[PDB]
Design a protein around this ligand. Structure first.
Ligand code: F1H
Length: 356
């Protein structure tokens, strides 16, 4: 339908994440919370860290309940650590409901909070299997669905340079143009998808598609870049470099070691046997103003981060185990080329593209 009061409920800074306003405890304690489809923990600052505008003060909340258990969460760059419990959570600019969700009260963290950022926590919207310490700690959205009449679905419109919309429990049709195209969620842990073909400026990379999903391919609102696996990255860069011989750039720039074009198509597995669709991004999407090359190599797989997500309206249709892509109404298009979602295409042996 409409969900007009949820539109434009996300803020941020370039490369610094997208956040929704949330309240915790009774009376409500307001916190800005990073929106992360690449993790499954709801975690907030609960101690006066210098970088924080505010923090969760448990002693002030009557509805707080201690779970008397600790949680240690190391990311690649840095870690956070906290004390588990539950409390009443709301999303002011979301649905009118209040849920008892697990909260990780961050007592200690290293390289997690950003000096100068305006957020105080993280909302992991992915599934239980990747929730820390283990799959028994129910992720926020799972509690929201179990406790209220909010449908098991949420959508994201991230708008490049910073704002956007998280539509909880539905789809706002104003936020996209044309048809939605759905790819199946491979397994419910990350939001894992299968990439079946990659074109740089409408030319196939001719690679084994099993390479494009090396380990995994996921939709990650918490990652800034498009993260391509090493083997795919090298072939992609060489091809992007080939199109861009009009200009000159240092060797380290493509490696993400310096600062300062072809469209990039990702063919994704469709709902139907031998059927695919493709999503297409403009240079506006992978050239991030600080300009930086917002495509980087990875060992964990393809991460369809903010670079990808900023061109498209993205439906996390958890109910139907699928993810929807449509042209975002807010993506950065010029007069020449426009970001696209196109289909159907004929693609055989798509099932073989998923690494095991
Ligand atoms: O581990 C993964 C998926 C690996 C394939 S790329 N995603 C994490 C999930 C946690 N998220 C937290 C975070 C987000 C923004 C700023 C700081 C930290 C960082 C990205």
């Amino acid at each position: 339908g409409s969900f007009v009061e949820m539109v434009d409920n996300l803020r941020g800074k370039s490369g610094q994440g997208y956040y929704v306003e949330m309240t915790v405890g009774s009376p409500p304690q307001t916190l800005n919370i990073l929106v992360d489809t690449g993790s499954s923990n709801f975690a907030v600052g609960a101690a006066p860290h210098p970088f924080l505008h505010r923090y969760y003060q448990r002693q002030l909340s009557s509805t707080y309940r201690d779970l008397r258990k600790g949680v240690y969460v190391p990311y690649t760059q840095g870690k956070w650590e906290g004390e588990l419990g539950t409390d009443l959570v709301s999303i002011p600019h979301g649905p009118n409901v209040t849920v008892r969700a697990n909260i990780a009260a961050i007592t200690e963290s290293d390289k997690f909070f950003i000096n100068g950022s305006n957020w105080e926590g993280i909302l992991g919207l992915a599934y239980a299997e990747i929730a820390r310490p283990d799959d028994s700690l129910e992720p926020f959205f799972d509690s929201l669905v179990k406790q209220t009449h909010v449908p098991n679905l949420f959508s994201l419109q991230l708008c490049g340079a910073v704002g956007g919309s998280m539509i909880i429990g539905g789809i706002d049709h104003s936020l996209y143009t044309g048809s939605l195209w759905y790819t199946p969620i491979r397994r419910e842990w990350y939001y894992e998808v299968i990439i079946v073909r990659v074109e740089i400026n409408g030319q196939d990379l001719k690679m084994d598609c099993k390479e494009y999903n090396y380990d995994k391919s996921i939709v990650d609102s918490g990652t800034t870049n498009l993260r391509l696996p090493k083997k795919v990255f090298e072939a992609a860069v060489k091809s992007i470099k080939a199109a861009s011989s009009t200009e000159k750039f240092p060797d380290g720039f493509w490696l993400g070691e310096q600062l300062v074009f072809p469209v990039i198509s990702l063919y994704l597995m469709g709902e139907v046997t031998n059927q695919s669709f493709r999503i297409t991004i403009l240079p506006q999407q992978y050239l991030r103003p600080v300009y930086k090359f917002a495509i980087s190599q990875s060992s964990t797989g393809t991460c369809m981060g903010a670079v990808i997500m900023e061109g498209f309206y993205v439906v996390f249709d958890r109910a139907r185990k699928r993810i929807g892509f449509a042209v975002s109404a807010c993506h950065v298009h010029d007069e020449f080329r426009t970001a696209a979602v196109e289909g159907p295409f004929v693609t055989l042996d798509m099932e073989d593209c998923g690494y095991n």
